[PDB]
Enzyme design. Structure first.
Site: not given
Length: 266
Positions: A43, A141
């Site tokens: 991330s 993601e």
């Protein structure tokens, strides 16, 4: 002494691979350790992703309402999973992507950037425009966290991502009013208390973006300010491929690497 020996000891003790870059300043040497080795973004990409969106749009864009469904929740999304009915402004998505590491927010910000890979190509192109010839993002993601170690497709280097963050936060890649937004979201991150933050004394300011994933991946990218207001960029990346895809990530390793860096910088 030798700092590199001490990082090597952390690797032995935590059974981990550690990468560290702190860019040189007018008064300090660079800190580098496996700084040109590739590590998964995880991330950490969401910091520069927010920059890419800011870069391409006037501030009014932040007020633009984005609509989505429960079926778009494909990753850990602490904020977006409570706003399916109302939607979320681009600004709210930026906030969530950084401060809560929200994956749906990131996916929607990638769609906002536009193009193939759902925005992944646009993202990588933004990095190329900051002088980053190394980093790449191919997937969304949650897949981008789960590649095997030998796949470079969603990797950066401590060196590359540090110099990206350097330009974005302390340089002139963004105009001041956009630079302020990124800075503030990272400043008020909720996910980083056990990483770089835990390695610096409380009178230092720490802004950061974490990343976590498979093969024991734990990352933190930060900008820190001394009590005198001198800034440094600190990128710390780690993995534990010897423990398999489900190796436990070790925030402590990042905290202790940060501590070593703080000893050098203070």
């Amino acid at each position: 002494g030798d700092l590199a020996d001490r990082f090597a000891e952390l690797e032995r003790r935590y059974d981990a691979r550690l990468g560290v870059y702190v860019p040189a300043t007018g008064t300090t040497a660079a800190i580098e350790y496996r700084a040109d080795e590739r590590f998964a973004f995880c991330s950490t990409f969401k910091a520069p992703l927010v920059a890419a969106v800011l870069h391409q749009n006037p501030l009014t864009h932040l007020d633009k309402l984005i609509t989505y469904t429960s079926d778009d929740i494909r990753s850990i999304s602490p904020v977006a999973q409570q706003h399916v009915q109302t939607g979320m402004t681009i600004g709210q998505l930026c906030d969530a992507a950084i401060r809560y590491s929200d994956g749906t927010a990131a996916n929607l910000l990638l769609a906002d950037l536009g193009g193939p890979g759902g925005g992944t190509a646009a993202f990588t192109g933004y990095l190329r425009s900051l002088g980053d010839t190394v980093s790449r993002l191919d997937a969304e993601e949650p897949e981008l966290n789960r590649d095997p170690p030998g796949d470079e497709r969603n990797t950066t280097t401590p060196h590359a991502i540090a110099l990206v963050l350097q330009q974005l936060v302390l340089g002139n890649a963004l105009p001041p009013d956009k630079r302020a937004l990124l800075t503030d979201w990272m400043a008020r991150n909720t996910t980083g208390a056990k990483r770089i933050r835990a390695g610096f004394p409380a009178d230092w300011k720490v802004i950061d973006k974490t990343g976590t994933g498979d093969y024991g991946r734990a990352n933190d990218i930060a900008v820190v300010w001394s009590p005198t207001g001198v800034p440094y960029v600190v990128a710390v990346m780690s993995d534990r491929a010897g423990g398999g895809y489900d190796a436990e990530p070790r925030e402590a390793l990042l905290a202790e690497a940060a501590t070593c860096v703080a000893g050098v910088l203070a």
